[PDB]
From a paper:
Glutathione transferases (GSTs) are promiscuous enzymes whose main function is the detoxification of electrophilic compounds. The isoenzyme [name]-1 is primarily expressed in the human liver but can also be found in various other human tissues. It is a key enzyme in human physiology, since it is involved in the phase II detoxification mechanism of a wide range of electrophilic compounds, such as drugs, carcinogenic metabolites, and environmental pollutants. Cytosolic GSTs are dimeric enzymes with each subunit having two distinct domains: a conserved N-terminal thioredoxin-like α/β domain and a C-terminal α-helical domain.
The improvement in the catalytic activity of [name]-[name]/[name] as well as its thermal stability prompt us to investigate the structure of this mutant at the atomic level using X-ray crystallography. The mutant was crystallized in two crystal forms with four molecules (1.56 Å resolution) and two molecules (1.87 Å), respectively, in the crystallographic asymmetric unit. Both forms display the typical dimer state found in other GSTs. Residues 212–221 at the C-terminal were not included in the structure because of high disorder. The analysis revealed that each monomer of [name]-[name]/[name] retains the well-established structural features of GSTs, which consist of the presence of two distinct domains. The engineered amino acids are at the surface of the enzyme. The results showed that the mutant [name]-[name]/[name] exhibits higher catalytic efficiency, thermal stability, and sensitivity against α-endosulfan compared to the wild-type enzyme. The double mutation [name]/[name], according to the crystallographic analysis, results in subtle but specific changes in the protein structure, and the observed stability may be attributed to specific interactions within an amino acid network. The results demonstrate that the mutant [name]-[name]/[name] depicts higher catalytic efficiency and stability than the rest of the mutants studied; the mutation [name] is likely the main contributor. The enhanced stability properties of [name]-[name]/[name], along with its increased catalytic activity, can make this [name]-1 variant a new potential scaffold for future applications.
Author numbering:
A (entry chain B): 1 to 207
B (entry chain A): 2 to 209
């Protein structure tokens, strides 16, 4: 049915991958429509499906949603992964915008000139070890629960675990002094819908 | 309920959209400005900053960092975030397009004093051929005075703030968009916004 969400993006991770993780974790089946030529982009534009002429775009519930955060916020709410009230959403939002800030740096490394790259990567790795991983370890340490917010699965656990996988590609030792994050990574990775999303053949896009 | 407390530099920066939103909602707030390294160090050493950065807003017993987290909370608390999940989708779509355009403008004075004319020209093209058409199209399709749900929402507030910023950047980009000009005057005459717009308000000055 026109009821499987359709994700429109290039055939890469890029700015669609966190949506791909969130839907998989919510157990939602979806289709992908890949931009592989200028004509794929022109057709979406001409059909009037791109509010600001840009992808990501997700067809969902009769809507043509653009802007990653709008897409993510809607999916999270629809599948009850956005906390139970305004205060839980503020915690989730705080946490995931920190994650998004870090992801944005990693995502913007290739734009750097060939020589800037390593110096900029080294600073990212330092922020992971000294700023971001301590902040999230502290959240889990302080309430003792198996999830970041509300004592249940939320998009914050899913976005964080996604980031732990990307950080592993940078330096597999960055998580080593953070046992609670390692346990979170394992716990979330073993959830049936996520485990299915992580074995080969599933959607999940490569680096 | 005490007044929210806004921790930032004494500048527009990444706190200004929060100032507009609170003022629009008729909410009184305090500001504590960072004017030295000592000010930042104290916030950090006190544990007030999750990721050691500002903006930070003390509100309802939380120490909220990340602009989007701050804005999302305030918008929901004062009924400026639409009436349901699909209205929030439209609002989110709109305001992230606004946020994208604002981020290019904010990141313009970090350009080398040479290739900034190129960046400024790309910005003006996107305003005229991409962003202003998109919002004019939205208003024309439904004819109503507000972006979403015939009701004031953060989307009207964030757009009109951007309209004022575009205007200081270039008086003319709005010329061929009358519904945007119309939205700007209407929102600007709401009592709370009208007050925020007069001199003496917490509205921070530009960066000339």
């Amino acid at each position: 049915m026109a009821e499987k969400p359709k994700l429109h993006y290039f055939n890469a991770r890029g700015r669609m991958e966190s949506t791909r993780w969130l839907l998989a974790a919510a157990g939602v089946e979806f289709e992908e429509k890949f931009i592989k030529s200028a004509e794929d982009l022109d057709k979406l534009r001409n059909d009037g499906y791109l509010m600001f002429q840009q992808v990501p775009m997700v067809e969902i519930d009769g809507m043509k949603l653009v802007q990653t955060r709008a897409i993510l916020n809607y999916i999270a709410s629809k599948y009850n992964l956005y906390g139970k009230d305004i205060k839980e959403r503020a915690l989730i939002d705080m946490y995931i915008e920190g994650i998004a800030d870090l992801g944005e740096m990693i995502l913007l490394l290739p734009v750097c000139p060939p020589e800037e790259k390593d110096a900029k990567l080294a600073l990212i790795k330092e922020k992971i070890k000294n700023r971001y991983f301590p902040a999230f370890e502290k959240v889990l340490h302080h309430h003792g629960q198996d999830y970041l917010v509300g004592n249940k699965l939320s998009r914050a656990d899913i976005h964080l675990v996604e980031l732990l996988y990307y950080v592993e590609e940078l330096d597999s030792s960055l998580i080593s002094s953070f046992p609670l994050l390692k346990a979170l990574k394992t716990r979330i990775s073993n959830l049936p819908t996520v485990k299915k999303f992580l074995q080969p053949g599933s959607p999940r896009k490569p680096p």
